[PDB]
Structures are given as structure tokens and as C-alpha cells.
Amino acid sequence: TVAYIAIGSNLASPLEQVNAALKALGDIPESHILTVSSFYRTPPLGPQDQPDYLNAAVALETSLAPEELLNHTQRIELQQGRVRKAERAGPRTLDLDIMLFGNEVINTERLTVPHYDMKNRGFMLWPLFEIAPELVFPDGEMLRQILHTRAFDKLNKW
Ligand SMILES: Nc1ncnc2c1ncn2[C@@H]1O[C@H](COP(=O)(O)CP(=O)(O)OP(=O)(O)O)[C@@H](O)[C@H]1O
Ligand SMILES: Nc1nc2ncc(CO)nc2c(=O)[nH]1
Ligand SMILES: [Cl-]
Ligand SMILES: [Cl-]
Numbered sequence: 637t638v639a640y641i642a643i644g645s646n647l648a649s650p651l652e653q654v655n656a657a658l659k660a661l662g663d664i665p666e667s668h669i670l671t672v673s674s675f676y677r678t679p680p681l682g683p684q685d686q687p688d689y690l691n692a693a694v695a696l697e698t699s700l701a702p703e704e705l706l707n708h709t710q711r712i713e714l715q716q717g718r719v720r721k722a723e724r725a726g727p728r729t730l731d732l733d734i735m736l737f738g739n740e741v742i743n744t745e746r747l748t749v750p751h752y753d754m755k756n757r758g759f760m761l762w763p764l765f766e767i768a769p770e771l772v773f774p775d776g777e778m779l780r781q782i783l784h785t786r787a788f789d790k791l792n793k794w
């Protein structure tokens with residue numbers, strides 16, 4: 637299955653954090669990376685009172701079940717110092733969010749797929765479009781269409 641994972645970091649050298657995360661993602665059992673987006677420098681959502689993010693996206697081919705992939709992404713976060721979860725955000729070393737998992741629609745205590753807010757976030761959609769320009773969402777909407785019918789502005793490269 638192809639999982640699309642959003643990567644963000646705005647603490648402790650985001651470029652090192654993202655490169656470390658890429659290496660770790662490739663080492664997840666029963667998985668290998670297919671594609672990696674460019675790296676983008678984005679202002680934080682909300683409280684402007686924190687550093688800029690590095691944002692990226694990757695496509696991961698995996699035979700793991702969705703929650704198994706989640707367990708691994710959460711362990712990579714922890715190994716890279718990310719401890720606060722489901723709280724108001726302050727600067728974080730790493731955030732790995734599962735944007736899409738195949739064409740699956742998941743609404744559990746642990747996992748909401750497609751990511752609940754991705755269609756509102758250029759920092760998720762533009763890196764995804766760079767690696768998957770022909771992508772269609774589970775509800776039949778095309779990614780290209782979402783990005784143009786609502787005039788999302790372009791991002792700056794890191
Ligand atoms: N698609 C998904 N990817 C990652 N975590 C998800 C997820 N759907 C639900 N979750 C849940 O989200 C919980 C909180 O994760 P956090 O990383 O703290 C949210 P965040 O990434 O800071 O906000 P965001 O989801 O608005 O980007 C996790 O414990 C996980 O169970
Ligand atoms: N620019 C930017 N802001 C964010 N704000 C909150 C969150 C919550 O995870 N993520 C991000 C992000 O990835 N990029
Ligand atoms: Cl943290
Ligand atoms: Cl959808």
C-alpha cells in the first residue's frame with residue numbers, strides 16, 4: 637500500500653530532524669520510501685510565536701496495517717525527542733502525520749485518515765502534489781483540483 641506521510645519540524649535543526657526522519661522511515665519493517673518532496677520553509681500555523689517549519693511529504697510503500705505504521709511513526713517521533721501529543725502546539729522536533737493510506741477511510745480513536753485538515757493546508761498539499769500530481773482522494777476529488785479551485789499560494793523552499 638502507498639502511505640503518504642507529512643513531515644514537519646521547527647525545533648533542534650529542522651533540516652537534520654527531517655533527514656533523520658527520512659532515514660528512520662526507510663528502516664520501518666516491510667516498508668520502503670518511494671518518493672520525497674522538496675523541503676519547504678513555512679510560517680507556523682496560528683501563534684506566530686514559534687520558529688518556521690520545515691515541511692515535506694513522502695510516499696512510503698508498506699505491507700503494514702495502518703495502525704502498525706502509526707506505531708512506527710510514533711516511535712520515530714519519540715526517538716527524535718517528540719513527547720507532547722494531542723496538545724496545543726509549541727515547537728517540536730518532529731511531527732509525522734499520515735495523510736493518506738491507500739484509498740482507506742479510517743475513523744478510530746487512534747487514526748483519522750484522510751488527515752482531517754490536510755485539504756486546508758498548503759504545507760501538506762503542495763509537497764504531496766509534488767510527489768503525487770495525479771492523486772485522487774478516497775472521495776473522488778483530485779488533488780490538482782483541490783489546489784487550484786481555491787488559490788492556495790505557493791510555498792518557499794527551505
Ligand atoms: N492521520 C494521523 N496521523 C498521525 N496521527 C494521527 C492521525 N490521525 C489521528 N492521529 C492521532 O493524533 C494524535 C495526536 O498527534 P499530534 O501529532 O499531537 C497532532 P498534530 O500533528 O500536532 O496536529 P495536526 O493533526 O493538526 O497536524 C496521535 O496520538 C494519533 O493517535
Ligand atoms: N507551518 C506549519 N505549521 C504547523 N502548525 C501546526 C502543526 C500541527 O502538527 N503543523 C504545522 C506544520 O506542519 N507546518
Ligand atoms: Cl514535544
Ligand atoms: Cl477524501
Ligand SMILES: [Mg+2]
Pocket residue numbers: 662663664665666667668669
Ligand atoms: Mg525498508
Ligand SMILES: [Mg+2]
Pocket residue numbers: 731733
Ligand atoms: Mg501535524
Ligand SMILES: [Mg+2]
Pocket residue numbers: 731732733
Ligand atoms: Mg502529528
